[PDB]
Amino acid sequence: VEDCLEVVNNRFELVMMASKRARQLANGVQPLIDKPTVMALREIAARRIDNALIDEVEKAERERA
Amino acid sequence: MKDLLNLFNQQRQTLDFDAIKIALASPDLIRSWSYGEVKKPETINYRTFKPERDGLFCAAIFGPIKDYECLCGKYKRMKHRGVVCEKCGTEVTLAKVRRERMGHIDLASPVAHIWFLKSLPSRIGLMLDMTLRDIERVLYFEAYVVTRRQLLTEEQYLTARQEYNDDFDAAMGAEAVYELLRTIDLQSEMTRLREEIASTGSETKLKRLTKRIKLIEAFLESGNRPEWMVMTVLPVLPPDLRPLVPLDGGRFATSDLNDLYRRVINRNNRLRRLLELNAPDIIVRNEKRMLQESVDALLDNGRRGRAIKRPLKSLADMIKGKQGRFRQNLLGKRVDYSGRSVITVGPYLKLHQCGLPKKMALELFKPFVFAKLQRRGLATTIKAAKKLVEREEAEVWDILEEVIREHPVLLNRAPTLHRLGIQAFEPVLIEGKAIQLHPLVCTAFNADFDGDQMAVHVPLSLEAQLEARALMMSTNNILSPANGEPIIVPSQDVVLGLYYMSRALENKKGEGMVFANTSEVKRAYDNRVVELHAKVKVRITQVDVDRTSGTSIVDTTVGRALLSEILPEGLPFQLANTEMTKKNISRLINSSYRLLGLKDTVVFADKLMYTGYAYATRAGVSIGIDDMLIPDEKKGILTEAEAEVLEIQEQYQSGLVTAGERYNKVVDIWSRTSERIAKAMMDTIGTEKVENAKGETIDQKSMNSLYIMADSGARGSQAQIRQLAGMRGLMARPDGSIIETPIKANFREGLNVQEYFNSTHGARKGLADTALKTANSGYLTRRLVDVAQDVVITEIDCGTTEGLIMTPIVEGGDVVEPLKERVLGRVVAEDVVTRNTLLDEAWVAKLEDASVQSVKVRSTISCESSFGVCARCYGRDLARGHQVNIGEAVGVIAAQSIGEPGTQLTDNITVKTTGSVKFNNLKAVSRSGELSVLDGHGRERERYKLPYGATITAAVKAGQSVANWDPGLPRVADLFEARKPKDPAILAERSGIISFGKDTKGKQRLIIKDTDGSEHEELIPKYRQIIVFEGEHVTKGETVVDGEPSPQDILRLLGVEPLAAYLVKEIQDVYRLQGVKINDKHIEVITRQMLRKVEIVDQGNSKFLNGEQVERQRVIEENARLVKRNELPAKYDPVLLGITKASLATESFISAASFQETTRVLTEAAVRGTRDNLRGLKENVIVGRLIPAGTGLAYHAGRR
Amino acid sequence: TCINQRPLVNVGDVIARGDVLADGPSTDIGELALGQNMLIAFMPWNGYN
Amino acid sequence: EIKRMLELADLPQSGQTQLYDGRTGEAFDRKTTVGYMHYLKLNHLVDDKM
Amino acid sequence: VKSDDVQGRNQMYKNIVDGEHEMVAGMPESFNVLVKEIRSLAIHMELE
Amino acid sequence: VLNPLGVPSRMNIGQILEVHLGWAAKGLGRKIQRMLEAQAAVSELRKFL
RNA sequence: AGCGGAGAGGUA
DNA sequence: GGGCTAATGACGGCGAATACCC
DNA sequence: GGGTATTCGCCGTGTACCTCTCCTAGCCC
Ligand SMILES: [Mg+2]
Ligand SMILES: [Zn+2]
Ligand SMILES: [Zn+2]
């Protein structure tokens, strides 16, 4: 959790970003790298997923719906 | 009764609003509220289960009993909606409208509301300009009212009617008060009162006039009416909110509101029957008096009438109090997905995981088990899945093990006075009936293992699970919220093993050899060829951080070399080279958290607890009756004290000394005897074992169980050891007197009955003391939480360059708080260093090497933010060593950290330490003298006070005198509430030359002459002393009366920052006399919350004698002086309020009516017609929205 | 809880006025019995105590 | 009196004897106090609270 | 969601047993009880 | 297996004397059982009592 | 068949 | 037996009315 | 009219949990 507090300064923004990534992963999607929240935190700490990419995936899922 | 088709549809209510408006209710609006009128006081008819028509429980007024059903049964279908039956008139609708619809009562005579009359700020008394006793006599039918405002006895009314021949009208009762409230105007009376306000010259009459002006202004700008205070139409509660409870045998439980409603309806029907009969005036007067008394018992029972062995509840008692509808159902709610069990200790667990029973986790994780059983295909429906769960095969255990793997649970202690009372753990399935817990967790929980129960909760949403993983995990909460020390400390059984392993002996087997590395030491110890306590010079390789590796040879112990296998590469060997004690391992854990990180400290603490248990099991430490030694010196000093007390008894009986001085000499020589016996016992316990090395007996420290358990830590101190070896000394009585004879026997020998009587007396006194301490600590914690709850870190930078001067606190003895503790944790204001830079331990070490005395700091008492605290003015966080995040509620943490140790609370200037003496504010002719000293490092250890005319004798050594001669928790509660003392110190009002007194007219007068300004006279009582010289000069803020000063005259005279400095100094003095360590940011934000209100004296937009907020007055002043004005803003002074008055004086009527005096805040919000903007933390809990602190700040940013 | 009165006298033995005939619940032959007797060792054992 | 009743049988005087560990078979460093204590059971069960 | 709301606990339970994640919060019913108890004291309390 | 750390904190040492007296009582009971196990005389039991 | 107001005892 | 039937063993802090001679 | 001096009330005084009993019953037949 130290790397997750290293890639972003604020903690609540990290919580909201991991919540959005876990909501995207729970509906069924391929991850960047077993629980959805733990995989979201591992994808955050590996500097693979960004908030802009999360918003792009959410916009693609809203357009596909 | 039962309905399943309507139950499936959801999202019917949006529940989206912005504000909450509370005001009065007109009788036409109350008539538009209800749906029917009740007329009979009959709820349920006898010998049948059917409601009574036009009663308290009726179907024509509120709603049907059964769902989609009438009373007769003509309509028994769900398709019929909005149709009223013909025989019994009710709507065929849902049965949930009985909880929403309400009724009303048409009263034959108007009555007065008791919330506008019986309150001490009476509104009808201020609006009609009448006293309370006159309206109390008029409303209770004892006198008359002319219609200009004077009282009339019935005999005087008869003489007035005979003299006026029945021409002037005069009425009695509430109808005359209603006519008086109807025929008054709000505009012309306001202009008349403003005309009288410019001609008055009195003090209290001006206060009455501006109170009447404020009441008329509130009645004008609220949109209400003065005649709406009397109640013509009385609304009733819905019957589903006040249900009847049945008992066995057909009986029903008694109710409180139903009996009052039946009494009101019965007296109203009796009044209607007496009015239709055309009764005389006495009978209808008594009936109206009984109607007023029943309305008073219905609204607020127990105030004036107290209608009944036990008084029943009413509408006023159902809101206020602890058992009301506000504290039992809104703040604290019963939750599901939760349970409790007893706790045991689990040494095999990790820090982030805990134990959980199998059936308990099966009951808690039942919906996830049902969902996984539906997904796996083992059951088509949930009924077969539930039967497979209750059958308890192996597949449900596989499902329960697969579900609980990555799902955290919230473990909670039943008292939650700590910030860390709720922690998140990853549970495992154990074969038991208790909840296993890690031993490093119960220190922060303050939980024992004898009958302790802990309630668990499971988060089920994804956001709640991620919040519990991020900011509630036990591995993330290492540091304490009060101080910088970590809350995880190794307890007694592991520091006992560490102290047994780290000690060294003189002569042991296997010493004097050289080993290669740590693995050779382990291989030599595991083959039983070398003892654990042996001075063996080993060679270890450690890297040094700035990472360069190095090797060296150190002369250590075998146990200290075995301890080096668990230390990481970052920690140096200078910390683990000494003997392991409680403070040594505490500062070692602190250094490992400071210079290495987070997870390495967690795994190091886990390995440390493991090796502590492993080397405390192999030690076999046991206490017995042979470990406690009894000296002959104890008997020697006992016979010496017996001879000396016989000598002083003969000297007292001879007639040379009195009884009290002899008794004081007796208790002093017995205290000296007990001190000498305790010193001899500590000398014969701690220095008992003498070892022989190389044929010579060299003295070393003894290895006894009691001495090791006293020296290691996390056990009893030396006061507990001296009660077992030597005598326990004198005993204290609760009246204040010490007993003349002590207890000259420990627990190892026998105790007499007269000593055991004093022992159980002291035990009962201590038990009552800690009971009242726990109660007062809980009350102070609740008050401090409700005071400081609006401060939220909103912005990152403000731009305030005010600052605060930090000085080390010396109170005439040992230091209270040094510079390295008070400075560390905040940014600086002025260059001492670079401004707006967070200070670390390296900066504190650099400032200590530079020998700095005072540095300007940025505190929260001087901030320029709008409804919040800046992130830079607060400094660093207490749980994490970095900067405080945006959105952290720093008020609740501060109040909880102040409320931590409340259950644990309770001439000659000769220097003690050496160092150079430097005078401060000296000229001996000096008003305020400080005899501060400077040590070699540059810190101030001693600081003594110097009176007027102190002769100083003086690179000054210790043991000399520079100036020779010149002839608990209620304290913290009185500091926070700022109560006036019994003897208040009168300070100087103005800075001028002191003059002689005036003529004495019962009180002393003191005038201070100025250059151009006139002298000001201050009255003082002649009972107290006074020290004013004739030919002397008095500076600003000097104290002319010796006594305890109040916060008010300290705040209003010289400034704000010395007031906060004095408050922080006194609170830290109390908390360091206790022994605990609490940071000063909590006291600073409490002082900032206490200074929220401001008082103006002459303004153009607002009034001249009203209080307002600081930031609101500032934004109104800048909006006034920004455009088309030059002399707009006014000068104001800061005012102080206590903790009981700061939370009540709030524009939010929900949070102000939350803890104390609900009726006063409710009637104030009803009269003024306030609007709650929901800009708080508790009102978002009451309404049900998100908390505007932490993860909910983005929702409040996107909402507005 | 369960209460029980088990007898303790035998067949054909003389007694006096005041002797017990049946031990009551949590009661010995004439002494009060609350618990059992078992070996105690005062030592830390792997953190389980 | 307690020391005399201890010394009447084949028991040590101080009441502390050296016992071995059952897990590894090794001997402890010190002697512990071994004896019989009248230990009872309370009514606060684990089934009533869980 | 867990304690006070009538429809909220049913929606959360069916979202748990269905697999989807859509949390819709609402006002507690005890707040409506407090509003109906304040309105019985002839004091108008409106949710603007 | 009890914990000896509670003894200096709670400041009671009557349990240690109770442990020693129970150890002496169990030793006396074992000696009486060893005396009555073999064929012993009445005078040895009389002088032991 | 579910919704409760007092009184008493006990644990942390 | 049966079915309706309307006490005076607390304690502390605090804002507001009386009493009254100058 | 206007300052002390008592004085009558108003309002508050820790949390969590586990067992048990008893609930308006009175009367002229
Ligand atoms: Mg306990
Ligand atoms: Zn009908
Ligand atoms: Zn600021």
PDB file of C-alpha atoms in Angstrom, chain B residues 908-911 917 919 924 931 946 949-957 959-966:
ATOM      1  CA  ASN B 908      13.903  31.141  47.640  1.00  0.00           C
ATOM      2  CA  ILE B 909      15.499  30.607  44.228  1.00  0.00           C
ATOM      3  CA  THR B 910      17.833  27.596  44.420  1.00  0.00           C
ATOM      4  CA  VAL B 911      18.862  25.996  41.134  1.00  0.00           C
ATOM      5  CA  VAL B 917      22.157  31.957  34.125  1.00  0.00           C
ATOM      6  CA  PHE B 919      18.204  37.071  32.975  1.00  0.00           C
ATOM      7  CA  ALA B 924      16.088  44.802  41.514  1.00  0.00           C
ATOM      8  CA  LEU B 931      15.384  33.332  36.530  1.00  0.00           C
ATOM      9  CA  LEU B 946      11.614  36.753  40.988  1.00  0.00           C
ATOM     10  CA  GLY B 949      13.216  43.770  45.242  1.00  0.00           C
ATOM     11  CA  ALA B 950      14.822  40.333  44.929  1.00  0.00           C
ATOM     12  CA  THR B 951      18.508  40.458  45.863  1.00  0.00           C
ATOM     13  CA  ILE B 952      20.591  38.485  43.348  1.00  0.00           C
ATOM     14  CA  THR B 953      24.067  37.301  44.326  1.00  0.00           C
ATOM     15  CA  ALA B 954      25.360  36.954  40.755  1.00  0.00           C
ATOM     16  CA  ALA B 955      29.051  30.608  34.414  1.00  0.00           C
ATOM     17  CA  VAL B 956      27.193  29.607  37.590  1.00  0.00           C
ATOM     18  CA  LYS B 957      27.689  26.094  38.938  1.00  0.00           C
ATOM     19  CA  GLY B 959      24.312  23.668  44.240  1.00  0.00           C
ATOM     20  CA  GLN B 960      24.166  27.438  44.814  1.00  0.00           C
ATOM     21  CA  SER B 961      21.491  30.132  45.038  1.00  0.00           C
ATOM     22  CA  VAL B 962      21.518  33.121  42.693  1.00  0.00           C
ATOM     23  CA  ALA B 963      18.612  34.830  44.479  1.00  0.00           C
ATOM     24  CA  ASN B 964      18.787  34.003  48.184  1.00  0.00           C
ATOM     25  CA  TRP B 965      15.605  35.456  49.693  1.00  0.00           C
ATOM     26  CA  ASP B 966      13.089  38.274  49.302  1.00  0.00           C
TER      27      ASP B 966
END
